[PDB]
Amino acid sequence: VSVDLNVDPSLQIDIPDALSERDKVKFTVHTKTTLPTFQSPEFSVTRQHEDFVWLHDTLTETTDYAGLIIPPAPTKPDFDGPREKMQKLGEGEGSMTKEEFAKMKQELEAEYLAVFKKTVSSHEVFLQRLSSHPVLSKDRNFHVFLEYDQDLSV
Ligand SMILES: [Cl-]
């Protein structure tokens, strides 16, 4: 076989759920850790795209990391494709039967969901990459990002 094996890793991060309200995304960032450095071995916080941008910016400009490979920022969530397509669909409502339109409305909702899912992955991959870096996983701004249980913006 050919296989990548992880045994009792000390830091695991994922985004198990997320919420879109008028195309504004809130990510649940859930962490599991066996490390002393964290207040708790398991916890979740709520993060927005700008929080991730904040974290990436502040790592990039950390003098000590200038020789390190910092994983790329996740891209800003963008629902313009699905939204514009749904608008076009609505304009064409008269040319179409009730059940044709229903079926297509459902298909475009699925298109929106696939965009959502993709931006989730992008944000999650970034955190997982940071958790795997021997130096960056220890960064205190990263820790603040994972655990500060209030609005990181303010
Ligand atoms: Cl957003």
PDB file of C-alpha atoms and ligand atoms in Angstrom:
ATOM      1  CA  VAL A   1       0.000   0.000   0.000  1.00  0.00           C
ATOM      2  CA  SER A   2       0.743   3.735  -0.173  1.00  0.00           C
ATOM      3  CA  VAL A   3      -0.662   5.628   2.872  1.00  0.00           C
ATOM      4  CA  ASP A   4      -0.345   8.730   5.010  1.00  0.00           C
ATOM      5  CA  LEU A   5      -0.659   7.733   8.696  1.00  0.00           C
ATOM      6  CA  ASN A   6      -1.563  10.095  11.558  1.00  0.00           C
ATOM      7  CA  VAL A   7      -1.261   8.786  15.129  1.00  0.00           C
ATOM      8  CA  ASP A   8      -2.756  10.765  18.033  1.00  0.00           C
ATOM      9  CA  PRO A   9      -2.031  14.135  16.452  1.00  0.00           C
ATOM     10  CA  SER A  10      -1.734  16.939  19.022  1.00  0.00           C
ATOM     11  CA  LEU A  11      -3.745  19.585  17.085  1.00  0.00           C
ATOM     12  CA  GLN A  12      -6.805  18.969  14.917  1.00  0.00           C
ATOM     13  CA  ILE A  13      -8.887  21.726  13.362  1.00  0.00           C
ATOM     14  CA  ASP A  14     -12.006  21.575  11.243  1.00  0.00           C
ATOM     15  CA  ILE A  15     -15.048  23.581  10.181  1.00  0.00           C
ATOM     16  CA  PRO A  16     -18.001  21.278  10.875  1.00  0.00           C
ATOM     17  CA  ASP A  17     -20.728  23.807  10.108  1.00  0.00           C
ATOM     18  CA  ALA A  18     -21.158  27.247   8.656  1.00  0.00           C
ATOM     19  CA  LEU A  19     -23.891  29.747   8.162  1.00  0.00           C
ATOM     20  CA  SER A  20     -24.642  32.119   5.263  1.00  0.00           C
ATOM     21  CA  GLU A  21     -26.983  35.088   5.846  1.00  0.00           C
ATOM     22  CA  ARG A  22     -27.401  37.281   2.766  1.00  0.00           C
ATOM     23  CA  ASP A  23     -24.087  35.837   1.502  1.00  0.00           C
ATOM     24  CA  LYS A  24     -22.192  36.733   4.741  1.00  0.00           C
ATOM     25  CA  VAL A  25     -20.524  33.556   6.065  1.00  0.00           C
ATOM     26  CA  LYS A  26     -19.971  32.565   9.674  1.00  0.00           C
ATOM     27  CA  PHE A  27     -17.647  29.624  10.126  1.00  0.00           C
ATOM     28  CA  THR A  28     -17.580  27.384  13.185  1.00  0.00           C
ATOM     29  CA  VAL A  29     -13.930  26.716  13.851  1.00  0.00           C
ATOM     30  CA  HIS A  30     -13.725  23.558  16.039  1.00  0.00           C
ATOM     31  CA  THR A  31     -10.405  22.493  17.651  1.00  0.00           C
ATOM     32  CA  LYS A  32      -9.204  19.327  19.371  1.00  0.00           C
ATOM     33  CA  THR A  33      -5.860  19.366  21.104  1.00  0.00           C
ATOM     34  CA  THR A  34      -3.751  17.328  23.574  1.00  0.00           C
ATOM     35  CA  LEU A  35      -1.474  20.357  24.097  1.00  0.00           C
ATOM     36  CA  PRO A  36      -0.939  22.070  27.505  1.00  0.00           C
ATOM     37  CA  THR A  37      -0.872  25.476  25.757  1.00  0.00           C
ATOM     38  CA  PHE A  38      -4.648  25.597  25.316  1.00  0.00           C
ATOM     39  CA  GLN A  39      -7.151  26.396  28.061  1.00  0.00           C
ATOM     40  CA  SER A  40      -9.265  23.425  26.999  1.00  0.00           C
ATOM     41  CA  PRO A  41      -8.730  20.185  25.014  1.00  0.00           C
ATOM     42  CA  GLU A  42     -11.825  20.801  22.852  1.00  0.00           C
ATOM     43  CA  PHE A  43     -13.582  23.994  21.862  1.00  0.00           C
ATOM     44  CA  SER A  44     -15.347  25.834  19.043  1.00  0.00           C
ATOM     45  CA  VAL A  45     -15.370  29.523  18.042  1.00  0.00           C
ATOM     46  CA  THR A  46     -17.219  31.574  15.350  1.00  0.00           C
ATOM     47  CA  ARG A  47     -15.099  33.199  12.669  1.00  0.00           C
ATOM     48  CA  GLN A  48     -15.629  35.405   9.618  1.00  0.00           C
ATOM     49  CA  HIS A  49     -13.554  35.686   6.500  1.00  0.00           C
ATOM     50  CA  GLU A  50     -11.812  38.903   7.680  1.00  0.00           C
ATOM     51  CA  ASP A  51     -10.634  37.028  10.815  1.00  0.00           C
ATOM     52  CA  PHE A  52      -8.767  34.625   8.581  1.00  0.00           C
ATOM     53  CA  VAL A  53      -7.357  37.546   6.585  1.00  0.00           C
ATOM     54  CA  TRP A  54      -6.332  39.085   9.932  1.00  0.00           C
ATOM     55  CA  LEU A  55      -4.552  35.857  10.935  1.00  0.00           C
ATOM     56  CA  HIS A  56      -2.794  35.488   7.587  1.00  0.00           C
ATOM     57  CA  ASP A  57      -1.683  39.151   7.542  1.00  0.00           C
ATOM     58  CA  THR A  58      -0.238  38.999  11.005  1.00  0.00           C
ATOM     59  CA  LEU A  59       1.730  35.799  10.291  1.00  0.00           C
ATOM     60  CA  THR A  60       3.071  37.123   7.004  1.00  0.00           C
ATOM     61  CA  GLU A  61       4.417  40.253   8.703  1.00  0.00           C
ATOM     62  CA  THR A  62       5.897  38.370  11.679  1.00  0.00           C
ATOM     63  CA  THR A  63       9.634  39.005  11.334  1.00  0.00           C
ATOM     64  CA  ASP A  64      10.533  35.508  12.651  1.00  0.00           C
ATOM     65  CA  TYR A  65       8.522  33.795   9.895  1.00  0.00           C
ATOM     66  CA  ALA A  66      10.090  35.606   6.936  1.00  0.00           C
ATOM     67  CA  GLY A  67      12.091  32.473   6.100  1.00  0.00           C
ATOM     68  CA  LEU A  68       9.048  30.195   6.518  1.00  0.00           C
ATOM     69  CA  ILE A  69       6.472  29.037   3.967  1.00  0.00           C
ATOM     70  CA  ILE A  70       3.181  30.478   5.192  1.00  0.00           C
ATOM     71  CA  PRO A  71       0.171  28.655   3.672  1.00  0.00           C
ATOM     72  CA  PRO A  72      -1.962  30.837   1.363  1.00  0.00           C
ATOM     73  CA  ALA A  73      -4.976  32.769   2.652  1.00  0.00           C
ATOM     74  CA  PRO A  74      -8.449  31.366   1.914  1.00  0.00           C
ATOM     75  CA  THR A  75     -10.257  33.383  -0.760  1.00  0.00           C
ATOM     76  CA  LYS A  76     -13.126  35.676   0.156  1.00  0.00           C
ATOM     77  CA  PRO A  77     -16.483  33.849  -0.171  1.00  0.00           C
ATOM     78  CA  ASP A  78     -18.135  34.894  -3.414  1.00  0.00           C
ATOM     79  CA  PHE A  79     -21.721  33.900  -4.213  1.00  0.00           C
ATOM     80  CA  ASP A  80     -22.137  36.161  -7.330  1.00  0.00           C
ATOM     81  CA  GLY A  81     -22.297  33.255  -9.788  1.00  0.00           C
ATOM     82  CA  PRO A  82     -25.197  31.428  -8.102  1.00  0.00           C
ATOM     83  CA  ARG A  83     -26.966  34.676  -7.121  1.00  0.00           C
ATOM     84  CA  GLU A  84     -26.861  36.145 -10.601  1.00  0.00           C
ATOM     85  CA  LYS A  85     -28.039  32.873 -12.096  1.00  0.00           C
ATOM     86  CA  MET A  86     -30.971  32.744  -9.679  1.00  0.00           C
ATOM     87  CA  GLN A  87     -31.901  36.288 -10.601  1.00  0.00           C
ATOM     88  CA  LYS A  88     -31.915  35.322 -14.317  1.00  0.00           C
ATOM     89  CA  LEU A  89     -34.042  32.317 -13.401  1.00  0.00           C
ATOM     90  CA  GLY A  90     -36.593  34.578 -11.686  1.00  0.00           C
ATOM     91  CA  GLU A  91     -36.846  36.831 -14.719  1.00  0.00           C
ATOM     92  CA  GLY A  92     -37.658  33.772 -16.825  1.00  0.00           C
ATOM     93  CA  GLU A  93     -40.400  32.507 -14.514  1.00  0.00           C
ATOM     94  CA  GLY A  94     -43.313  33.149 -16.936  1.00  0.00           C
ATOM     95  CA  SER A  95     -41.787  31.029 -19.741  1.00  0.00           C
ATOM     96  CA  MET A  96     -41.738  27.864 -17.678  1.00  0.00           C
ATOM     97  CA  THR A  97     -44.166  25.534 -15.886  1.00  0.00           C
ATOM     98  CA  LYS A  98     -44.508  25.572 -12.051  1.00  0.00           C
ATOM     99  CA  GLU A  99     -42.681  22.235 -11.659  1.00  0.00           C
ATOM    100  CA  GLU A 100     -39.929  23.078 -14.196  1.00  0.00           C
ATOM    101  CA  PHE A 101     -39.204  26.282 -12.285  1.00  0.00           C
ATOM    102  CA  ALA A 102     -39.352  24.454  -8.903  1.00  0.00           C
ATOM    103  CA  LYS A 103     -36.912  21.849 -10.147  1.00  0.00           C
ATOM    104  CA  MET A 104     -34.513  24.468 -11.442  1.00  0.00           C
ATOM    105  CA  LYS A 105     -34.776  26.634  -8.300  1.00  0.00           C
ATOM    106  CA  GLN A 106     -33.689  23.558  -6.327  1.00  0.00           C
ATOM    107  CA  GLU A 107     -30.814  22.945  -8.761  1.00  0.00           C
ATOM    108  CA  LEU A 108     -29.502  26.500  -8.304  1.00  0.00           C
ATOM    109  CA  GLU A 109     -29.763  26.207  -4.521  1.00  0.00           C
ATOM    110  CA  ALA A 110     -27.564  23.133  -4.940  1.00  0.00           C
ATOM    111  CA  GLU A 111     -25.161  25.237  -7.050  1.00  0.00           C
ATOM    112  CA  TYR A 112     -25.022  27.833  -4.261  1.00  0.00           C
ATOM    113  CA  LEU A 113     -24.379  25.089  -1.703  1.00  0.00           C
ATOM    114  CA  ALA A 114     -21.495  23.735  -3.784  1.00  0.00           C
ATOM    115  CA  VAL A 115     -19.902  27.191  -3.819  1.00  0.00           C
ATOM    116  CA  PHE A 116     -20.431  27.463  -0.048  1.00  0.00           C
ATOM    117  CA  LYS A 117     -18.918  24.050   0.509  1.00  0.00           C
ATOM    118  CA  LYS A 118     -15.902  25.018  -1.585  1.00  0.00           C
ATOM    119  CA  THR A 119     -15.206  28.221   0.384  1.00  0.00           C
ATOM    120  CA  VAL A 120     -15.555  26.211   3.619  1.00  0.00           C
ATOM    121  CA  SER A 121     -12.887  23.802   2.384  1.00  0.00           C
ATOM    122  CA  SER A 122     -10.611  26.653   1.438  1.00  0.00           C
ATOM    123  CA  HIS A 123     -10.879  28.137   4.974  1.00  0.00           C
ATOM    124  CA  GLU A 124     -10.497  24.746   6.667  1.00  0.00           C
ATOM    125  CA  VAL A 125      -7.439  23.714   4.560  1.00  0.00           C
ATOM    126  CA  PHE A 126      -5.726  26.957   5.607  1.00  0.00           C
ATOM    127  CA  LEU A 127      -6.195  26.163   9.349  1.00  0.00           C
ATOM    128  CA  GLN A 128      -5.164  22.525   8.945  1.00  0.00           C
ATOM    129  CA  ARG A 129      -2.019  23.632   7.106  1.00  0.00           C
ATOM    130  CA  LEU A 130      -1.238  26.011   9.986  1.00  0.00           C
ATOM    131  CA  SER A 131      -1.846  23.240  12.550  1.00  0.00           C
ATOM    132  CA  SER A 132       0.650  20.962  10.736  1.00  0.00           C
ATOM    133  CA  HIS A 133       3.464  23.504  10.631  1.00  0.00           C
ATOM    134  CA  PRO A 134       5.885  22.785  13.545  1.00  0.00           C
ATOM    135  CA  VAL A 135       6.605  26.540  14.005  1.00  0.00           C
ATOM    136  CA  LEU A 136       3.314  28.174  12.883  1.00  0.00           C
ATOM    137  CA  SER A 137       1.073  25.797  14.872  1.00  0.00           C
ATOM    138  CA  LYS A 138       2.614  27.302  18.004  1.00  0.00           C
ATOM    139  CA  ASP A 139       1.969  30.913  17.067  1.00  0.00           C
ATOM    140  CA  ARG A 140       0.070  32.849  19.712  1.00  0.00           C
ATOM    141  CA  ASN A 141      -2.005  34.819  17.207  1.00  0.00           C
ATOM    142  CA  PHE A 142      -3.064  31.444  15.759  1.00  0.00           C
ATOM    143  CA  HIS A 143      -4.044  30.430  19.293  1.00  0.00           C
ATOM    144  CA  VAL A 144      -5.991  33.645  19.768  1.00  0.00           C
ATOM    145  CA  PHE A 145      -7.737  32.902  16.441  1.00  0.00           C
ATOM    146  CA  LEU A 146      -8.678  29.383  17.633  1.00  0.00           C
ATOM    147  CA  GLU A 147      -9.806  30.189  21.158  1.00  0.00           C
ATOM    148  CA  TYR A 148     -10.702  33.908  21.815  1.00  0.00           C
ATOM    149  CA  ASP A 149     -14.394  33.377  22.598  1.00  0.00           C
ATOM    150  CA  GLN A 150     -15.600  36.924  21.767  1.00  0.00           C
ATOM    151  CA  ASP A 151     -15.709  39.152  18.612  1.00  0.00           C
ATOM    152  CA  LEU A 152     -12.141  39.070  17.211  1.00  0.00           C
ATOM    153  CA  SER A 153     -12.992  42.139  15.165  1.00  0.00           C
ATOM    154  CA  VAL A 154     -13.231  44.419  18.224  1.00  0.00           C
TER     155      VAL A 154
HETATM  156 CL    CL B   1     -18.421  36.466   3.915  1.00  0.00          CL
END
